[PDB]
Every structure is written in structure tokens, then in C-alpha cells.
């Protein structure tokens, strides 16, 4: 019986607090009880974990430049989009097939 | 490529959050 | 009877001062608390975005006209025609099977 911890037994040990605080990352800067669960996870994962970012190799490493391109909508595709979206909002919000 | 005033943008929004999620999770490496 | 009367003759209840810290915000909670429009289910967030865009851009009338013509209307017409000819084929099959059965019963 060398089991690590049950999928339900891992919900007490971090788990629900982790995705509770983390998904509410706006208040995650409080780090009063969040640091407890984060530290527990770090300690429990240290025996089996190994991660190294691009900080280990940076002397000759071109950087990444993220760019977002905005595209307009064509006339007949706009017609298609409006028709489909109005039909979907009329069907889903109420009785349907 | 993201179309303005469309559903796609909203979907894109979701992704970015999960990205920074990892940025406040992974802290392993060489322990002191 | 004295203790009950003494307890019932209290000093009123002046300790609360009408406490109501949030729980819950009327509309800010529903629209943004926090990100991603709590229970957004992006379809309706897209509804708000598309309605605002079409209103501000003033594209409502031609869109309404072309959707009165519509694209899915042609699909509904095609599926109606398909159902009609399928029903006709089914009727032909049923009548032919009935004729074959009556001929077979007559023969034997």
C-alpha cells in the first residue's frame, strides 16, 4: 500500500484552495493562506520535479515578439454571422429542438 | 489573427489568463 | 415569572448599526466580479458585443433585411423538400409492399 494519495484525498491537500485562490488571482497577492498551499505543493513536488526555463540558456537566444493583428468582417460573412448568431440567441435562450 | 467585435476575442481572453496561471505556479529548479 | 419578565424587559437591540458589507453587489458582481463576466458562457457576452457593435456602426437595417431573406431559410426550404420526397418514397414503398402482400395472399 505505497499509494501516493487518492484523487479525492488530494482535494484536502491543496487542490480546491489552489484553483480557488489561483482562479481569483486578483486577490492572490494577499498570500496569507495562499502561500501555505503553494508551499505545500512545492514541498510535495520537489522530490519528483525538474524545470528549467529559458533563463538557463540566454547568452545566444533570440527573443519572442508577440503581435496581435485585427481583421475586419466582410459583408456577406457579416450577414452569415448575424443570421447564425441571432438564430442561436433566439433558440438557446428559450425552447428549441 | 483575431477579429474585432467577434466571439474569437473573448476566447483569446480566456487563454491569456491560464498563461499567467503557470507564471504563478512553477517555482522549482535549484533549491537554496 | 420575575426572571422571564426581566429577560423580556431588555435594553432593545442596539449593536448592529445596519451592517451590510457587500453580499452581494447588484450588477457589478454579475457583469465583472472578477474577470470573464461571472458565468459568461461567451454566447451572451458575444450577444452584448455584437449588439453594441451593430448599434454603434448603424448596420441594423440592411442586416435585418438580408436576414429576412436569410441564409438558413434556404436550408429549411431544402430540408422541407427532402422530407417531402422522402415521405413520397416511403408511401410508394408501403403501397408496393401492400400490393405484393395482397397478391401473395391471393395466390396461396
Swiss-Prot record, chain B:
It comes from the Eukaryota. It is found in: Nucleus. Component of the SWR1 chromatin-remodeling complex composed of at least ACT1, ARP4, RVB1, RVB2, ARP6, YAF9, VPS71, VPS72, SWC3, SWC4, SWC5, SWC7 and SWR1, and perhaps BDF1. Present with 656 molecules/cell in log phase SD medium. Catalytic component of the SWR1 complex which mediates the ATP-dependent exchange of histone H2A for the H2A variant HZT1 leading to transcriptional regulation of selected genes by chromatin remodeling. Belongs to the SNF2/RAD54 helicase family. SWR1 subfamily. This is Helicase SWR1. The gene is SWR1. The chain holds residues 1369 to 1400 of 1514 of the full protein.
Curated annotation (Swiss-Prot), chain C:
Residues 4-24 are annotated as: Disordered. The modification Phosphoserine is found at residue 14. Residues 22-99 form the BCNT-C domain. It is found in: Nucleus. Residues 5-16 have a biased composition (Basic and acidic residues). Belongs to the SWC5 family. Component of the SWR1 complex which mediates the ATP-dependent exchange of histone H2A for the H2A variant HZT1 leading to transcriptional regulation of selected genes by chromatin remodeling. Involved in chromosome stability. Present with 1680 molecules/cell in log phase SD medium. Component of the SWR1 chromatin remodeling complex composed of at least ACT1, ARP4, RVB1, RVB2, ARP6, YAF9, VPS71, VPS72, SWC3, SWC4, SWC5, SWC7 and SWR1, and perhaps BDF1. This is SWR1-complex protein 5. The gene is SWC5.
